[PDB]
Symmetry: C2
Subunit: 65 residues, 2 copies
């Protein structure tokens, strides 16, 4: 048997973090109070703008529906 996964590539979009949040790639704070980084619309990964270029494109998550 198998889980069902949604498999694609990340879809990053600038996001307004309402509390201090860290880059899921590098571990440093997403600096500032607005538009601090990007959140993947599909899997929720948070990255610095600069880290968008560093992450693997692979985007998967378990579909728990």
């Amino acid at each position: 048997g198998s889980r069902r996964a949604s498999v694609g590539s990340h879809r990053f979009k600038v996001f307004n973090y309402m509390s201090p949040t860290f880059c899921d790639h590098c571990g440093s704070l997403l600096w500032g109070l607005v538009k601090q980084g990007l959140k993947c619309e599909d899997c929720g990964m948070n990255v610095h703008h600069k880290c968008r270029e560093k992450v693997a494109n692979l985007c998967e998550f378990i579909v728990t529906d």
Copy 2:
């Protein structure tokens, strides 16, 4: 670039076909007027009861959402 796909295993459920439908595995008619076979709830594959055991479990479809 990558499509987004849902990737899992088939989820077959007995189905009552309304019009003449063929087995997606073997090509023979799904005989009868009721419960003629099974349809995968995820990808729509149609199979005879006897062909359920013959198909690969892999179930994928492109999510066009």
